[PDB]
Amino acid sequence: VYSEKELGIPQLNTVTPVGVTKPKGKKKGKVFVDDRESMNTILAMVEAEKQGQIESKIMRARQLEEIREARRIEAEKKEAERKALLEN
Template structure:
């Protein structure tokens, strides 16, 4: 009785060859060669399956020459190539000083322009005020003039009435009493 060997390999041929005596060695060789060929064929066929993998090469949009869509890419998505990821810190004193100098110059300019504008506005306002004052003065002086002239005329009349009280009664007589008038409309 042949010793029972535990089944180790799953292939049938393997078990057969181990259990049977070496009488049909040619057959076995044939089988082996066939299996070897098969294996070789299988092995060869494996690299043959490579080319379809090659087709999976990913082309960039540039290579394809696809016209680009006119769309907005969010700022978070945009990644400039060749640039370092993350924030760029300003920690050295020189770069901070340059930023500060820029800011200072900017502010100085702003303040200067503000002051200039304020000064110009002030000048315009002053000129306007002066003009208004001059106009007021003119108006007042004209008024005074007319007042004076009226006063003078009044005084002259008074003087005249004082100096010639007796000579006048006659010319007053021809003056008719005012007619009564009626107006329509």
């Protein structure tokens, strides 16, 4: 058993998009996360994974919904940052 990271295994296009890939052995630019909104999105996923299985259908929906609102706020915040930087 050996890690796929250790082997130089090409990345494959699937239902999950590969996106823009980065060359190996080069500067993969650090994308810092420091906003409260960006931290909230990551935190919601972590909490959802730890909680795991919930028997209630409504309680399961609410856990998914709070991640959706966290994503929406982060996207709105980053959009406003782009507009301010582009305009001013």
